[PDB]
Design a protein around this ligand. Sequence first.
Ligand code: C7W
Ligand code: CL
Ligand code: CL
Ligand code: CL
Lengths: 99, 99
Amino acid sequence: PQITLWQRPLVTIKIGGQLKEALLDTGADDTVLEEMSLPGRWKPKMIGGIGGFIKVRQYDQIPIEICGHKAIGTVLVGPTPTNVIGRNLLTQIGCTLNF
Amino acid sequence: PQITLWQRPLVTIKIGGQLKEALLDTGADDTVLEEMSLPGRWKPKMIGGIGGFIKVRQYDQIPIEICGHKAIGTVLVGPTPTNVIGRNLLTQIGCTLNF
Ligand SMILES: CNc1nc2ccc(S(=O)(=O)N(CC(C)C)C[C@@H](O)[C@H](Cc3ccccc3)NC(=O)O[C@H]3CO[C@H]4OC[C@H](OCCC(F)(F)F)[C@H]43)cc2o1
Ligand SMILES: [Cl-]
Ligand SMILES: [Cl-]
Ligand SMILES: [Cl-]
């Protein structure tokens, strides 16, 4: 698809058996989601943005689907004010900026 | 251009006759630059991100070139960790997301 930027680029993702809404975020290195359970190992991480840092749990090798597009990657979980899909997964679905 | 997302989508901008580096950021409604001088009067704004909120100065109708593409619009100035070009200007230069 070609996604306009007149509005926030929100999509539905499928992760950990749940459907969630998230922002396609080229300014985010990493994918960060609000609190949720995920299986497998994790390690603590601090990530920083406008306003400072938050502590998150880093889960690796997590399957996700974004717009029919399957991928696998790292998902950070913690008290983000909004769910963001970062570059680590945007690359896997072949997402580019165009102008 | 078509810009992939394996690295940060950093581009050169020009504002007030000076070159700066900034991130093309589809997750940002607005454009926020690190401390700098701009002309005219400013208005207050609070913008929120991953770690909370910051206060910025809002300047309107500012000419800014992004990857050579000419825009004139609102620029917020304050203690952001990185210069970000948000959707207010990405739409002026005809930017879309594609996959
Ligand atoms: C109302 N209008 C309004 N206009 C706005 C304009 C902007 C913002 S915004 O910036 O809050 N943000 C909103 C979004 C999160 C919904 C945009 C987002 O793309 C942000 C951009 C950025 C990139 C780099 C640093 C800081 C911010 N990315 C981000 O947070 O990424 C995190 C997860 O991945 C890492 O990589 C990048 C960053 O690294 C942190 C490194 C350090 F710790 F800062 F050094 C880490 C809100 C605005 O509100
Ligand atoms: Cl990853
Ligand atoms: Cl590619
Ligand atoms: Cl604007």
